[PDB]
Symmetry: C2
Subunit: 862 residues, 2 copies
C-alpha cells in the first residue's frame, strides 16, 4: 500500500529535441513544409477554404492548412459524440503529437507511464461561440472537448503521461514560453520528457476584421526585412515537438542550449510596441548565463513579422547583442515570409524551420526580400545578411526570437548535433521490414518510403522501435523485404485478440542437397552451424563439409541426415531467439523432440547435437534387422488392429496417417495385403530401418547408456508438449525431465503427433521449423482452418533466405511480435542526423474516412 517516493533531483545533462510533426499552410506534413521552403513556394494562398476571399473586407490571402475535418477518433478512444463536440485544433494536435512521438523512435508502449509533461500553447477560443450559438442537449461533452485546459490533459490521458500538463497563453511568444517551462521542469527532476507544442486555427472572419482595425495586418505577404513591409498575414499551425534527456534519446535533431523569457515593462510608446532595449537585455542575459559566445551563431531565426515598427527594433537588438565582434555577416531569416504569421503558434513555426535547418544542413531561403529596409543600418553595414537563397549551414548554434504582442519577449538557443552517418554491415543485404498502420494505403506508402531508404539501417531501427504496437491500436500489420531480388509485400488486418505461437519441429524426411546453404548468408546462422560443427568435430564428424559440399550419396547414409537436420533446426531456433520470438508452445516429431528441448531451455546445444549423434550411432552400430516403415492410409485403431506380427504402428501423424513399421518380410506382405483391401500404403524410405517399434528395443537401451553420462536432467516446461509419452502418463516422473530415459522412450515408443497437435488452439500460428516444409499438409489437416501454417524453408528453393524472410513477414502480419534487426549488430543510439523523418509516413497513414464538424462562418453572425 505505501507508495515509493519519486526521486526529484536536479538534472545537469543535455536536453535534446527528438521528434517533430505538424500541419502547416499548404503542407500536410513536415516533408511538404520542407519541400515548399526549399523550393521558394509561397504557402499563403487565396481561396474560400475558411471564407470568401474578401468577405467582410478581410484580406484575401491567408495561410491555411489543407484540411481540419479529419480525425482518427477510434484510435484515441473518443466516441462520435465526443469527437463531434471536439475542437479541430485539439484533434490535429493529438494526431501531430502521436506522429512526433513516433518520429523520435518512441512508441505507445514505450511512452506509457513515463514522467512526461505536456505544455500546450493555445489561445483561439472561437469554437465556443460557434458551437454555442445554437446550443442544444448532447453538447455538454464540450467541457472535455473544447476547453483549452483539456488540450494537454487529453494528450496526457491518452498516452498515460504522469507529468505537469498545462496550457499557456502568452500570445505570439507562447510556444517558446512552453519550451522554457519544459526546460524548467526538466532541470528540476520532475519529468524526463516534454511534449511542448501549440496550435492555431482561423475560424472567425470578424476576428480578422478586428485585427485589421489595429493596423496589425498588411496588404501583401509578410515582407520581412523589406522597406515595403506594412503588416503580416494570418496563418495556421498545429505543430508539436518532443524533448528528452540526451542520454536516453534515440534521435537528436539538436540540443537545447537554453531558453529565457522577460517583459518589456513600461514604455511611453504604448503597450503594443516592441522594446529594443528589453530584447537586447534578454539576449545578453541568455548569452551570458550559459557562457555562449554570441559570435558563434551561424543562423538567426528572427521574429520578422514585416511590420515597419517591429523589424528595426529586432534588428537593432540583434546587432547590439549578437553582431558585436562578429567577423562575418550574421545570416538572419524568418519563416513568416514563407507561410505567414502563426499567431500563438508562431513560436513553434520557427522551431520547425530550425529543425529543418538542423536536419537538411541547409538554410531555407527567405521570400519577399527585394529592397533592404533603409531603417535597418545593419543590412548596409555588412553585419547582417538576409538569406535569400539556400545556404550550406555546416554546424554551430541557431538562435530564435519569438517576441510577442503585449510585451513578453522570449529567446532560445539550439546547438547542432553532428553525428554524420557511417556505413553498416547491412544496407546491402536483404532485410525484413515489418510495420503496422491504421490503413492499407498508409502501410503501402510506408513500405514505399522504406524501399526508398533501403540503404539506411538507422531508419530501419527507428521504424522497428515502434513496429511492435499491439493490433488494437494499429490493426493493419505488414511486412516487406528491402534489397530483395524478388519483390515481396504482405499486408493484413489483425484482430485485437492475440493468437498463440506454436513452434513445430519436423523429423526425418526433410533432408535434401543444399539445405540451409542460402541461410549461410546470415551471420547468426553461420555462427550457430560453426559452433555445432566444432562441437561435433571431436567425434570425427565434419558438419561443414556435409552441409556445404555434401552430395546425395552422402545424405543417403544414416548419420548425415540426423546431423544436418539437427544442426539446421538448432540454427533456425537460434535465429528465432535472436530475433526475439517467444514460442507460447513447442511440439516436435521424431528427432524433432531434441530441437524442442533445446528451444525450451531444458537442453543445450552440445547436449542436443550429442543426442542426435548418439541416436544415429545407435542406429548404425547395431545390426538392426532389415526393416521397413510405411505410411498406411488407415486410422490409428484400424492400423493397430490390421498390424500383423513383426509389425507395429509407429507414428500417428494425422487422423488418416500411420507409419506402420516392422520387419522387411512382414512389412512387405502386410503392405501387399493392405493394398489388397485397398489403402494408400506408400513406402517411407527410413534408411531401411524400422524406428519406434520393437526393433528399437536394443538401440534405445544403448542410447540410454550413451546418454546417461551426458544429458543432465532438467525440468520440462508446460510449453513443451511431449509427443512420445501419453497424456495419461504425463503426471508420472518419467515425463518431467528430458534425460537419457526420455530420449530412449521417444526413440522407442510411438510418436503421438496427433495427440500433441490436438492441444494446439483453433487459431494458433504454428511455425514449421525444419530444413523443408515436410509436415505442411499434415499440420494443416490436423489443426484446422483458423490456424496459420508457415514453413521457414522450401525444398530445392533457389533462394531460401527470401523464403525465410517471407514466412517471418507472414507470421508478423498474423500478429506475432519480432525484431527483424536482431540478426545484425545493434544500431548505436542516438542515430545519425542524416536519418530521414518518420513523422510524414504516419501523417499520411491515418484513417480519415469520417468527417467531423467544423465551425462555420454563419455561426459567428447574429
Amino acid at each position: 500500500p505505501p507508495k515509493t517516493p519519486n526521486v526529484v533531483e536536479p538534472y545537469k545533462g543535455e536536453v535534446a529535441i527528438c521528434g517533430l510533426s505538424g500541419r502547416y499552410p499548404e503542407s500536410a506534413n513536415v516533408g511538404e513544409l520542407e519541400y515548399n521552403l526549399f523550393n521558394k513556394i509561397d504557402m499563403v494562398t487565396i481561396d474560400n477554404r475558411r471564407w470568401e476571399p474578401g468577405y467582410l473586407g478581410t484580406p484575401e490571402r491567408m495561410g491555411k492548412v489543407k484540411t481540419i475535418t479529419d480525425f482518427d477518433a477510434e484510435f484515441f478512444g473518443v466516441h462520435t459524440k465526443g469527437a463531434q463536440t471536439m475542437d479541430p485544433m485539439l484533434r490535429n494536435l493529438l494526431e501531430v503529437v502521436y506522429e512526433a512521438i513516433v518520429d523520435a523512435g518512441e512508441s505507445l508502449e514505450s511512452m506509457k507511464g513515463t514522467r512526461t509533461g505536456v505544455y500546450i500553447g493555445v489561445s483561439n477560443n472561437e469554437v465556443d461561440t460557434a458551437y454555442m450559438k445554437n446550443w442544444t442537449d448532447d453538447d455538454a461533452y464540450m467541457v472535455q472537448g473544447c476547453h483549452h485546459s483539456m488540450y494537454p490533459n487529453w494528450i496526457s490521458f491518452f498516452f498515460d503521461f504522469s507529468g505537469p500538463s498545462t496550457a499557456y497563453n502568452t500570445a505570439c511568444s507562447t510556444s517558446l514560453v512552453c519550451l522554457d517551462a519544459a526546460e524548467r521542469h526538466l532541470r528540476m527532476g520532475v519529468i524526463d520528457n516534454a511534449i511542448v507544442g501549440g496550435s492555431n486555427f482561423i475560424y472567425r472572419p470578424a476576428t480578422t476584421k478586428l485585427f485589421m482595425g489595429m493596423n496589425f495586418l498588411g496588404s501583401s505577404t509578410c515582407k520581412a526585412f523589406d522597406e515595403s513591409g506594412d503588416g503580416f498575414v494570418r496563418g495556421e499551425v498545429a505543430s508539436a515537438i518532443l524533448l528528452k534527456k540526451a542520454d536516453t534519446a534515440k534521435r537528436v535533431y539538436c540540443t537545447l542550449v537554453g531558453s529565457m523569457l522577460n517583459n518589456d515593462g513600461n514604455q511611453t510608446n504604448g503597450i503594443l510596441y516592441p522594446n529594443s532595449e528589453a530584447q537586447e537585455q534578454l539576449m545578453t542575459d541568455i548569452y551570458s548565463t550559459h557562457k555562449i559566445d554570441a559570435n558563434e551563431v551561424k543562423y538567426f531565426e528572427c521574429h520578422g513579422t514585416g511590420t515597419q515598427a517591429g523589424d528595426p527594433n529586432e534588428t537593432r537588438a540583434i546587432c547590439n547583442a549578437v553582431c558585436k565582434g562578429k567577423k562575418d555577416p550574421l545570416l538572419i531569416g524568418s519563416i513568416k515570409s514563407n507561410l505567414g504569421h502563426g499567431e500563438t503558434a508562431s513560436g513553434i513555426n520557427g522551431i520547425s524551420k530550425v529543425i529543418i535547418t538542423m536536419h537538411s544542413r541547409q538554410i531555407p531561403p527567405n521570400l519577399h526580400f527585394k529592397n533592404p529596409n533603409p531603417k535597418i543600418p545593419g543590412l548596409f553595414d555588412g553585419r547582417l545578411k538576409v538569406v535569400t537563397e539556400t545556404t550550406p549551414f555546416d554546424g554551430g548554434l541557431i538562435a530564435i526570437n519569438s517576441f510577442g504582442m503585449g510585451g513578453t519577449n522570449a529567446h532560445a538557443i539550439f546547438r547542432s548535433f553532428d553525428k554524420r552517418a557511417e556505413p553498416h554491415p547491412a544496407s546491402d543485404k536483404p532485410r525484413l521490414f515489418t510495420y503496422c498502420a491504421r490503413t492499407e494505403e498508409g502501410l503501402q506508402k510506408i513500405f514505399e518510403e522504406a524501399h526508398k531508404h533501403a540503404s539506411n539501417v538507422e531508419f530501419h531501427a527507428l521504424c522497428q522501435e515502434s513496429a511492435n504496437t499491439k493490433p488494437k491500436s494499429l490493426p493493419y500489420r505488414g511486412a516487406t523485404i528491402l534489397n530483395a531480388e524478388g519483390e515481396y509485400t504482405e499486408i493484413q488486418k489483425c484482430p485485437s485478440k492475440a493468437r498463440e505461437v506454436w513452434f513445430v519441429y519436423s523429423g526425418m524426411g526433410s533432408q535434401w542437397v543444399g539445405m540451409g546453404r542460402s541461410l549461410m548468408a546470415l551471420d547468426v546462422f553461420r555462427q550457430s552451424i560453426e559452433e555445432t560443427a566444432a562441437i561435433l568435430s571431436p567425434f570425427g564428424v565434419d558438419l561443414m563439409s556435409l552441409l556445404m559440399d555434401g552430395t546425395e550419396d552422402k545424405l543417403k547414409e544414416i548419420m548425415p541426415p540426423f546431423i544436418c537436420i539437427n544442426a539446421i533446426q538448432l540454427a533456425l531456433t537460434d535465429l528465432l531467439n535472436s530475433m526475439g520470438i517467444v514460442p507460447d508452445g513447442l511440439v516436435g516429431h521424431s528427432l524433432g523432440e531434441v530441437g524442442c528441448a533445446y528451444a525450451d531451455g531444458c537442453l543445450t546445444r552440445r547436449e542436443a547435437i550429442l543426442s542426435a549423434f548418439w541416436r544415429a550411432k545407435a542406429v548404425i552400430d547395431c545390426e538392426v534387422k532389415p526393416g521397413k516403415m510405411a505410411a498406411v492410409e488407415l486410422t490409428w485403431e484400424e492400423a493397430k488392429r490390421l498390424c500383423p506380427p513383426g509389425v507395429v504402428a509407429a507414428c500417428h501423424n494425422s487422423q488418416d496417417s500411420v507409419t506402420i513399421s516392422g520387419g522387411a518380410q512382414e512389412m512387405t506382405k502386410f503392405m501387399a495385403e493392405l493394398s489388397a483391401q485397398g489403402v494408400t500404403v506408400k513406402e517411407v524410405n527410413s534408411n531401411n530401418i524400422s524406428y519406434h517399434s520393437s526393433f528399437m528395443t536394443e538401440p534405445a537401451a544403448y542410447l540410454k547408456k550413451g546418454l546417461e553420462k551426458e544429458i543432465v536432467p532438467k525440468p520440462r516446461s508446460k510449453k513443451w508438449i511431449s509427443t512420445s509419452i501419453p497424456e495419461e502418463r504425463w503426471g508420472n516422473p518419467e515425463a518431467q525431465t528430458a534425460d537419457a530415459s526420455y530420449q530412449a522412450n521417444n526413440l522407442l515408443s510411438s510418436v503421438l503427433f496427433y495427440e500433441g497437435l490436438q492441444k494446439i488452439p483453433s487459431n494458433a500460428i504454428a511455425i514449421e521449423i525444419a530444413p523443408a516444409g515436410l509436415l505442411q499438409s499434415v499440420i494443416k489437416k490436423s489443426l484446422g482452418q483458423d490456424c496459420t501454417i508457415v514453413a521457414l524453408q522450401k525444398r530445392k528453393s533457389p533462394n531460401n533466405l527470401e523464403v525465410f524472410f517471407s514466412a517471418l513477414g507472414k507470421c508478423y502480419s498474423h500478429g506475432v511480435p519480432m525484431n527483424p534487426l536482431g540478426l545484425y549488430p545493434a544500431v548505436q543510439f542516438p542515430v545519425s542526423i542524416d536519418t530521414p523523418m518518420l513523422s510524414s509516413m504516419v501523417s499520411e497513414a491515418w484513417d480519415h474516412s469520417a468527417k467531423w464538424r467544423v465551425p462555420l462562418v454563419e455561426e459567428f453572425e447574429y
Copy 2:
C-alpha cells in the same frame, strides 16, 4: 551602449507570501471575507445580479461578488475607449494586484523596475462572445483589453515589471500551477518577486446549463465531506498574492515550503474522474523531496467540491499519505462550502483561507457538515476531523490541494511565520500618520482604521512604506495625529506638479518662556538640545537650565535669547532632517543665517552654536552706547533716507515695513518726528542695542577675530539664499564661504530679507523654523497668495508637540515627502504576524464614480 548581463543564479533562500487581496462572493475585501468566514455566514445567495434565479433552469443560488462595474481607469492610465472594451475580470485583477502590492509594505516606486514575474490564471472568455455579437468599429482595443494574454502583461506594463508574464489555463488548479511556476522561476534566479493570482467571473447562463449537463452542479450548496453532497455551486473570485524573497520582505504571512504538480494519467473510469493513486503519489513526492514530516501538518485545506466521487478519493489519498503515523486527528477543511466553487480561481480561494488561517491564528469553520459521509472512513476511525467550529491553530504547516478537472493535480505546503509582536517605545505617545488616496472618503476611512490601530507601530510603518507616492498617482494627501489629546485631520487634493520647499529661519524676538519645553518629548529634539548644551558648557553657559527653568528675567538679558533661539533652531533642523525633509531652498533673517548654514551643510552644530555665542559675547563684552530699533512702515527708499545720521535702516522685512536702528537720542527724536507724520514707529526691545548699523562696526570686527580661528571656510550651496550680501556680490568671492567674514558682514550689513524672499517661487511651501511664528505676516505679505506658509511652533501654546505635528501634516498634505516615523527607532522587518491587513483600506479607498460596460445576458442569445 553595452548592457550589463543580469546575474541569473540559483536561489536557496526562503520564499514568503507578503501581500494578499481580492474580491470574494459577498465580500469587497479580505476583511469582509474573514469576518464572514469566522461568523459562519453563507456567501452564496439567491438574486438577479447576473441572471434571474432560475433563468434557463440554471441553479438559483450562486456565489457572486458585490460589483464588477467599477474601475479606476485614470489611475492605471487607461482611456475610456480602452476601459469600456476591457474585461471586468482584468480591471478587478489590476485593482486587487495594486491592493496586494500595497498590503506587502511596497509601493509603486519601490516595485517599479524590479525583476517581478506575473503568473495570472484565467480561463473564462465569455466576454468575447458578448462583445462580438454586435461588433462595431472602435472595438479593436479588445485585443489589448480582452485577450487573456493581456491579463498579466497589463500588470507588467503598469507596474513596469521586467519578468516573465504569463497566463495559465489549467481549469481548476490553475492558481496552484501558477504558484508552482513562480516558485520555479524564483529558485532559478530569473525573478525576485511574483504576482501569482487569478480571477473568475460568471456572465453566461448557458455556460451554467452546459456544466449542469455533465452533472457537475448539485442542488444545494457545496456540502463538503457530507453524505448528501451531490455537486458544487459556481463562484466568483478576483484574488491575487505577492511572493518575495524572505530576506527582503517587509511582511511575511507565511513561507512557501514547496509546491508540486502532476497528472492523473490514464484511467478506466474516464478522463473526468479523480485518481486517488495519483494524488497520493503527488503527496508522497512533495513530502519526501522537502523532507517535511507529514505528521507535522496541523490543518489541511482540501479540494472539497462536495461531489460524491471526489471527496472520498481525495480524503483516501490524504489519510494514506499524511495521516500515516499521526497520533491525533488531522483537521481537514475546504473553503468551497463557504463561498462555493471558484473554478479556475478556486486554488487562490484556498490560499486566501490559508493566509487568514495563518494570520488570525484561527481555523475558519466549515459549513453544511451535518452527517459524515459513510464512504469516507477516516471520519469514523479518528484519523480525520472536519473543522465545524473555530479552532486555535497555534502554528506549524498547512497543506493545500487544488485537484482540477481532467486530472492535473496540484499540492502546496506553507509554513507559519511566528514573530509575535513586541512593544515599541512609541504606540503610547502622539504620532503623525501621513497617507495618500484617490478619494477623500477613502482617505477618511484609512485614517479611521489607523486610529483603530493607534497602538501598533508596525502597521504605521507598513502604511508609511507606501505613503510617499507622487500626487499624480494618488492626489488626495492627508495627515492626522494618532494618540492625540486634540483631534487633528487634514485632507487636500494636491496638484500633479511638485512645489518647492523653502526653509525660513527667523531671527530675534521669538524668545518666550517655555520655548521647546513640549518638544522635549521627542527623543531627537532632546538629544540635540543636550548635545548643544554639552558643547556650550565649557564656556560657562547652561543651555539646559535656561531652556527649562528659565524665567522672563533670563530673556531680559542678551546672551540667553541668542543661545536659546539658536539651540531651538538647530533642534528643529535636526528633527526635520531625521524625518527626511530635503529643503530645496534656504533663507533666514538676522541670527537665522547660522541656522541656514547649519542646515545647508556648510556649517556644523558646534560652529553654529559658537558663532551665536560669539555674536552675543561681542555685544555683552565691548561697551555699546544705548540705542533703539523701530518698525517704521516706510519703504526702504523712504526709511533709509528719512533716518538722520546714526539712524539707519536695518532689515527689509517686506514690501512695506522697515526696521530703523540708531542711538538712543537720535532715534527717539527721529521716531517722534516720524510719529508726527502718519507712520507706525513701533519700537522693539533690543537690550538697548542697534544691530545692523554703523554702531555694529566695532563688534563685527571683534566677531571676526573671535570666529577667524573656529569657522572653517566651506562652500555655500545655491540652495542657501544670502540675506546680507546683495545679488551684485553673490558671485564675488566673499559670498562663497560662510567663514568669520560672512558672520561679521551679516552682523554689520543690512538684512535684505525682501530680496531673498523675491527669489522664492510663487507657489513654494515655506516652513518657518523658529521657537515661535513671528514672520508669518511678513512672509505671507512677501510671497503672495499661491504659496503655503506654515509655522512649526506657536507662542505660549499649551502643547507645542501637537502644533509641530499639525504643521508637518499640513506640509505633507500640500505635497512634500517626509518620514514621520524617523523620529523613533526603526521598525525591524519583516513585521510581526499580528499586524493588520492594509489591503482592505485601499480596496475601499478607490475612485469608483464611473460605471463601465459589463456583459449582458441578452448578448449570449442569438
